[PDB]
Amino acid sequence: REEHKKHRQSARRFAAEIRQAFSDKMAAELEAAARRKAEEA
Amino acid sequence: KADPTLQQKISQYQVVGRKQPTEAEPNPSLFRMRLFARNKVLAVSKFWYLLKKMKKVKKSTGEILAVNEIREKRPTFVKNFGVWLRYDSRTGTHNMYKEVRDISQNGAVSQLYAEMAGRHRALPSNIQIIRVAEIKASQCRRAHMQQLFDSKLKLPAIRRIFPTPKDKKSVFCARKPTLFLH
Amino acid sequence: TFKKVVVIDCQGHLLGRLASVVAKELLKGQQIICVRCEDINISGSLHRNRLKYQRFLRLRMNSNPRRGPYHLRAPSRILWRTIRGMLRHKVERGQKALARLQVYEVPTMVERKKRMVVPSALRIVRLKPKRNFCRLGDLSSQVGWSHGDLVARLEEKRKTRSSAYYQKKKERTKMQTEAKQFAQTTLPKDQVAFLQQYGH
Amino acid sequence: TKQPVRLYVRGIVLGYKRSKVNQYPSCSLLQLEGVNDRKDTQFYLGKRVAYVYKAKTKQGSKYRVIWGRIRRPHGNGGIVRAKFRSNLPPSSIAGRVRVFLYPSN
Amino acid sequence: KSVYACETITIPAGVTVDVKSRVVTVKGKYGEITRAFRHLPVDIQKTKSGNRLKVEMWYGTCTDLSCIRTLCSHIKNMFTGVMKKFQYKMRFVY
Amino acid sequence: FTRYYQPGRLCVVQYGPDAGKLCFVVDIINQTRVLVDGAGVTGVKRQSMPVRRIALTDQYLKIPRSVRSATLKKALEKDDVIAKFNQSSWGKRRLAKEQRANMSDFDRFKLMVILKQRRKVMQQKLKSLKK
RNA sequence: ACUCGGAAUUGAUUUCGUUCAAAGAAGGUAGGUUCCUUGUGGACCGUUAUAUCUUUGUUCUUUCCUUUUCCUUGUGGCUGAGGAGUGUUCCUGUUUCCGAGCUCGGUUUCUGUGAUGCUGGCUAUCGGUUCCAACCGACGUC
RNA sequence: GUAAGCAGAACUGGCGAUGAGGGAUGCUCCUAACGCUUGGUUAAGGUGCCAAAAUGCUCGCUCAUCAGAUACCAUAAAAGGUGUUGGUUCAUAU
Numbered sequence: 001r002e003e004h005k006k007h008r009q010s011a012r013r014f015a016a017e018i019r020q021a022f023s024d025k026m027a028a029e030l031e032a033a034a035r036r037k038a039e040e041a
Numbered sequence: 042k043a044d045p046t047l048q049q050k051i052s053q054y055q056v057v058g059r060k061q062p063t064e065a066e067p068n069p070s071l072f073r074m075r076l077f078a079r080n081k082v083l084a085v086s087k088f089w090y091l092l093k094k095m096k097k098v099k100k101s102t103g104e105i106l107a108v109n110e111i112r113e114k115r116p117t118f119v120k121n122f123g124v125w126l127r128y129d130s131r132t133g134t135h136n137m138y139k140e141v142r143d144i145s146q147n148g149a150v151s152q153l154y155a156e157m158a159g160r161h162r163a164l165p166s167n168i169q170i171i172r173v174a175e176i177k178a179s180q181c182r183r184a185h186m187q188q189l190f191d192s193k194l195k196l197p198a199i200r201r202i203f204p205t206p207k208d209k210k211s212v213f214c215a216r217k218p219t220l221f222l223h
Numbered sequence: 224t225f226k227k228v229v230v231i232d233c234q235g236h237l238l239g240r241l242a243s244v245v246a247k248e249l250l251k252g253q254q255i256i257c258v259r260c261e262d263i264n265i266s267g268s269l270h271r272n273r274l275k276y277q278r279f280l281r282l283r284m285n286s287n288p289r290r291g292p293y294h295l296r297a298p299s300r301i302l303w304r305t306i307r308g309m310l311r312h313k314v315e316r317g318q319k320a321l322a323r324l325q326v327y328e329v330p331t332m333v334e335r336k337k338r339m340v341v342p343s344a345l346r347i348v349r350l351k352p353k354r355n356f357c358r359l360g361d362l363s364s365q366v367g368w369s370h371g372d373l374v375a376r377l378e379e380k381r382k383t384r385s386s387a388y389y390q391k392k393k394e395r396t397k398m399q400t401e402a403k404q405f406a407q408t409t410l411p412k413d414q415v416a417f418l419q420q421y422g423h
Numbered sequence: 424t425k426q427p428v429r430l431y432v433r434g435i436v437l438g439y440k441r442s443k444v445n446q447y448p449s450c451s452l453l454q455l456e457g458v459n460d461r462k463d464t465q466f467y468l469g470k471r472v473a474y475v476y477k478a479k480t481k482q483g484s485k486y487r488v489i490w491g492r493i494r495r496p497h498g499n500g501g502i503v504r505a506k507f508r509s510n511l512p513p514s515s516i517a518g519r520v521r522v523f524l525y526p527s528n
Numbered sequence: 529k530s531v532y533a534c535e536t537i538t539i540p541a542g543v544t545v546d547v548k549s550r551v552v553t554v555k556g557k558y559g560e561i562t563r564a565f566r567h568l569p570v571d572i573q574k575t576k577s578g579n580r581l582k583v584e585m586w587y588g589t590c591t592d593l594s595c596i597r598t599l600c601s602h603i604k605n606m607f608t609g610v611m612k613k614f615q616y617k618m619r620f621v622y
Numbered sequence: 623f624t625r626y627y628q629p630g631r632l633c634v635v636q637y638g639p640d641a642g643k644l645c646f647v648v649d650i651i652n653q654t655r656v657l658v659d660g661a662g663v664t665g666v667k668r669q670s671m672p673v674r675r676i677a678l679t680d681q682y683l684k685i686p687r688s689v690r691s692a693t694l695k696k697a698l699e700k701d702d703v704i705a706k707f708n709q710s711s712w713g714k715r716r717l718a719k720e721q722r723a724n725m726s727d728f729d730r731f732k733l734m735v736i737l738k739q740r741r742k743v744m745q746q747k748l749k750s751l752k753k
Numbered sequence: 754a755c756u757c758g759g760a761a762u763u764g765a766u767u768u769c770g771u772u773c774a775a776a777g778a779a780g781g782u783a784g785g786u787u788c789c790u791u792g793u794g795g796a797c798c799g800u801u802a803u804a805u806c807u808u809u810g811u812u813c814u815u816u817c818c819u820u821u822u823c824c825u826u827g828u829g830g831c832u833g834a835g836g837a838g839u840g841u842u843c844c845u846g847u848u849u850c851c852g853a854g855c856u857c858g859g860u861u862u863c864u865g866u867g868a869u870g871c872u873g874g875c876u877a878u879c880g881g882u883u884c885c886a887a888c889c890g891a892c893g894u895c
Numbered sequence: 896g897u898a899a900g901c902a903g904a905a906c907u908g909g910c911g912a913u914g915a916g917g918g919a920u921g922c923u924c925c926u927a928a929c930g931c932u933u934g935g936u937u938a939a940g941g942u943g944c945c946a947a948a949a950u951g952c953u954c955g956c957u958c959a960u961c962a963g964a965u966a967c968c969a970u971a972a973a974a975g976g977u978g979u980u981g982g983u984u985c986a987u988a989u
Contacts, residue, residue: 159955224456252517422718513888
């Protein structure tokens with residue numbers, strides 16, 4: 001129970017390491033859709 | 042005690058496989074994907090199906106490292122979701138953008154397979170939900186979402202048909218019921 | 224597990240939904256009266272249901288239509304058929320069930336007794352509002368049931384009869400519950416707080 | 424006069440355990456007054472039952488009985504299975520039946 | 529579908545209006561019309577400053593939203609009835 | 623058209639596992655189903671309960687919108703709405719049906735001895751007030 | 754067959770929850786303006802003020818769910834136990850506590866392999882042969 | 896061969912020689928193969944009534960002056976619809 005409180009800083013850093021990575025891809029994919037509308041027209 | 046009946050049993054899962062080492066090509070490039078599924082097994086099934094469309098990989102030629110379950114951060118409060126998806130009609134494929142409102146991402150995707158089947162007759166097999174982002178109120182572009190937004194929102198209860206707990210139910214009653222209630 | 228008789232008021236009620244409840248209770252051995260069968264309802268419009276009743280009149284035994292499907296015009300007799308439609312009535316057990324059932328389009332006799340309501344088979348509950356419905360008394364008088372306006376008159380007569388009964392009873396509901404409030408004071412103060420736990 | 428003070432729950436013989444196309448008249452089928460779920464049924468399991476009826480002739484009295492007991496519940500409604508010493512006669516259907524509330528707990 | 533929608537009607541001066549239940553009596557100087565609206569799912573209710581008559585439905589689908597303005601037009605016709613009458617001139621032709 | 627699904631309206635929960643307990647609304651999710659909870663001491667954990675299940679009660683405590691489950695408990699203790707509902711009828715006979723269920727045999731005997739003794743005095747006045 | 758229960762563990766080493774602190778915001782409270790259809794109103798401006806919420810740390814919480822192995826008390830069903838005897842000497846179990854290095858040996862009471870125990874009705878029932886009723890079933894050869 | 900409950904082949908499985916439960920009803924479909932039976936559990940398939948089990952719970956769509964309703968299976972098409980419910984993409988609220 002003490003060793004649970006030890007690493008619980010690093011536990012939330014795994015939750016961020018996920019959500020950052022797919023939110024960047026979420027963002028990066030939408031900008032690809034914006035360019036194809038502009039460049040073709 | 043928590044009611045099983047309301048929701049579908051969807052859970053979100055991260056998956057990461059990597060093809061497989063060879064003497065030609067050691068240390069390959071790794072993959073990652075968020076998926077929705079019943080189970081820890083059925084996520085891996087759906088991973089290999091989707092990865093087969095992207096890249097020259099199979100379940101036999103591939104190797105899977107980790108299946109992390111993901112959940113919501115904070116499931117107490119209500120938030121807007123902009124779901125991107127594709128499905129297969131009897132003609133062909135169509136991309137869509139639906140907007141759903143619930144406490145959780147799991148709650149949204151349960152609500153969407155209901156909605157999508159009910160309208161478009163899209164079977165479970167055809168639908169593939171691409172990404173489920175969280176959206177600000179001043180962002181949802183659908184009109185059925187916008188009516189709900191605003192503080193002080195009120196909704197009167199109209200025509201009160203109560204699903205009586207069993208045992209409460211009787212085949213005959215005296216009085217005739219009261220539906221306006223007040 | 225059941226009462227001696229169960230008189231049903233049949234106004235507000237949907238015709239099949241009622242009958243399916245009533246059928247199963249006749250098989251369990253309950254004895255039933257149905258009452259005010261002219262006012263029973265059906266989903267769909269009046270035109271739609273009369274077109275369906277015209278498909279029923281088209282049926283007959285072509286050899287000798289004396290023999291064949293008896294087209295029964297009265298509301299009481301119409302409800303009776305759909306209850307019999309939900310019974311294995313050729314077998315002996317099925318026949319016994321009909322024997323229990325009594326259907327009326329309100330007489331003497333059971334104006335004096337209480338009329339109950341099946342709540343599941345009820346229009347205000349079931350039919351989502353706007354969706355057009357039809358009363359059986361209208362549908363029957365379209366198809367050659369002569370006695371619409373008597374069952375108007377007799378009901379309108381015995382509603383005035385019943386409102387005379389009501390205002391006697393309503394005066395002596397006051398009169399008991401006035402004498403209750405005296406009697407609740409005079410018995411000792413422990414047992415007043417005892418009844419206000421359990422409602423009385 | 425009448426019977427003073429009843430200590431039984433009262434009950435109807437519905438039929439037999441069956442499919443669409445097959446009786447199994449070993450196992451009778453029983454509805455009780457009040458009782459309306461599986462959760463309410465678990466009082467009545469074990470508890471001993473009597474079909475009474477009357478005959479034209481035997482041992483100093485015109486009435487007969489068939490004793491049995493309650494076995495287990497039947498579906499999500501209240502209805503509950505039973506086993507009698509004899510199989511129950513199909514004359515006994517829609518027929519009243521006394522569920523006594525012994526043996527107790 | 530749609531959460532709330534409400535149009536309002538101006539009552540003119542020499543008229544009175546008595547909406548009990550759905551049914552709406554309109555008495556003016558010339559005559560009086562009564563008319564029932566027990567088809568429409570709708571809450572009719574007049575105001576504190578009693579020359580205005582609001583009318584509203586919650587949860588109106590797009591077919592049933594079109595019965596809010598049908599109410600207003602019928603009630604407006606009942607007002608210009610009891611004030612002014614409705615003359616319809618017809619001409620013969622041959 | 624009294625009674626609105628709004629933040630901090632009191633509700634009787636009629637169907638579901640809770641059955642008969644009281645709850646407060648927090649937030650409207652969509653046109654069906656609402657973010658019902660209770661801080662205490664009803665003790666219904668917060669969830670996305672449907673609208674069909676829950677009878678709206680007259681009394682509400684006014685609070686803004688989506689709300690932390692602690693910040694009910696502070697705003698509750700000032701008003702005491704759960705107490706004030708329980709004063710009125712409906713509130714009373716809800717507690718009657720709890721305490722009728724929990725009677726002993728002697729406690730059920732107690733009732734009918736008092737109720738019959740009332741009727742002796744009730745019939746004496748019904749003859750006397752006639753006279 | 755259905756149940757009241759717990760005890761440790763796995764994940765994101767907390768999903769949440771909860772106490773504070775700063776920062777930010779709108780589906781903008783107090784506060785100003787102002788407006789009617791006078792409201793449990795709406796526009797403009799305001800960022801915690803006489804409501805708040807969210808992001809980010811922090812205060813102390815082991816349950817929601819989800820891995821993993823295992824000890825439990827409460828009701829019921831179906832089948833079986835029976836001509837006597839003696840009695841534990843051997844044997845497994847549970848138990849008294851004495852010594853040797855959780856494990857083995859010696860010793861005392863108790864229960865099993867060696868358990869059917871108590872009790873009632875009738876001396877006509879039980880049972881049988883016949884015919885009949887009822888629910889369900891059921892339309893030689895190439 | 897226009898096609899056929901038509902004619903002729905290949906691989907495996909059935910019917911024939913075979914009942915039982917389901918598909919209302921059916922030699923060939925589904926489940927599943929059978930000594931007499933007591934108890935328990937399922938399969939296919941179902942739970943308003945006939946009919947054993949949900950007028951169960953939860954979320955969409957549909958109003959038919961010929962609605963629709965369960966594989967084999969007991970038929971439906973080209974072409975239309977400002978009937979309604981969503982989506983995709985342009986152009987100034989439509």
